[PDB]
Amino acid sequence: TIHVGDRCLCRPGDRLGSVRFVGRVASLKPGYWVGVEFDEPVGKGDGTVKGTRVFQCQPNYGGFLRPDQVEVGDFPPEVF
C-alpha cells in the first residue's frame, strides 16, 4: 500500500520523489492514481488535471502514476 508522504522510485527510469496524493481521479482514467512530486524536473505535469489542481506542485515536478509504477522505499535525497 502507498501513503501520502511516502518516498518512492517511479517508472520509467527510477525517478525519485514523494507521494503527494493517492486516490481516484475521474478526469484521467478509471481506477486509483498516485500523485508524485519528483525531486528533479522529470514529471509530465504540475499536479493538475486539465487545469484543475489535485495536489500542490510546481511545473515539471508532478506526475500521476498508476500504483504499479511506484516503488515505495527508504529513498531519502542524497546528501553525503
Numbering used by the authors: 153 to 232
The authors write:
Five tubulin-binding cofactors (TBCs) are implicated in late-stage tubulin folding and heterodimer assembly 1,5–10. TBC-B and TBC-E are implicated in binding α-tubulin, whereas TBC-A and TBC-D interact with β-tubulin. TBC-B comprises an N-terminal ubiquitin-like (Ubl) domain and a C-terminal cytoskeleton-associated protein with glycine-rich segment (CAP-Gly) domain.
Crystals of the CAP-Gly domain of TbTBC-B were obtained from a construct producing the 81 C-terminal amino acids. The crystals are orthorhombic with space group P212121, with two polypeptides, labelled A and B, in the asymmetric unit. The TbTBC-B CAP-Gly domain is a small globular structure with a similar fold to other CAP-Gly domains, and is an important module for the recognition and binding of the C-terminal tail of α-tubulin 17–18. The fold is dominated by five β-strands, β5–β9, forming a consecutive twisted antiparallel sheet with β9 returning to lie in an antiparallel fashion at the other side of β5. The side of strand β8 forms the floor of a solvent-exposed, primarily basic groove, which is flanked by the two extended loops, linking β6 and β7, and β7 and β8. Glycine rather than asparagine occupies the third position, and this nonconservative change precludes the formation of a side chain hydrogen bond with the terminal residue of an EE[Y/F] peptide. However, and fortuitously, in our structure the C-terminus of chain A forms intermolecular contacts with the basic groove of a symmetry-related chain B. The C-terminus of TbTBC-B has the sequence EVF, which is similar to the α-tubulin tail EE[Y/F] motif, and so these intermolecular interactions can be taken to mimic the association with a relevant binding partner.
